[PDB]
Structure formats: C-alpha cells, structure tokens
Here is the input.
Amino acid sequence: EMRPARAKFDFKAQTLKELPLQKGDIVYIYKQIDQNWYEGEHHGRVGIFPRTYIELLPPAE
Amino acid sequence: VPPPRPPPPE
Here is the structure.
C-alpha cells in the first residue's frame, strides 16, 4: 500500500519532522497528513515532505 | 526554481 515517488527538486528540511530530499531520490509514501505534506520514508527513515516536490511513480511491470 | 514552499502543518 505504500506509494512510490521521485523527488523533482531538492527539499531542505527546516524542522526535525521533515525529511530532506535530493532531486532524483526515490521515496515511499504512507499517507497525506494535510493539504501540502506527505509522510513517507527514504532509506527507512520516516519524515514529512511537500506534495508538490515529488512525482508519484507508476507501478513496475 | 523549486515550487513555493508550503508552511509546516497546523
């Protein structure tokens, strides 16, 4: 049920809840927490990042 | 270059 996504831009974390991302990173989303933020994981670490900074990826064959 | 940054959740 986790949704794959790829970062379209760098995202700098400014709070201890946020997950930093580098453009091109593949991340996995658990849920949407509010209008602007997803909660997800990168390399097993959980945090939040912006909806608009990622693209949702299609399923693998 | 990146999209407008959203504020942290309420």
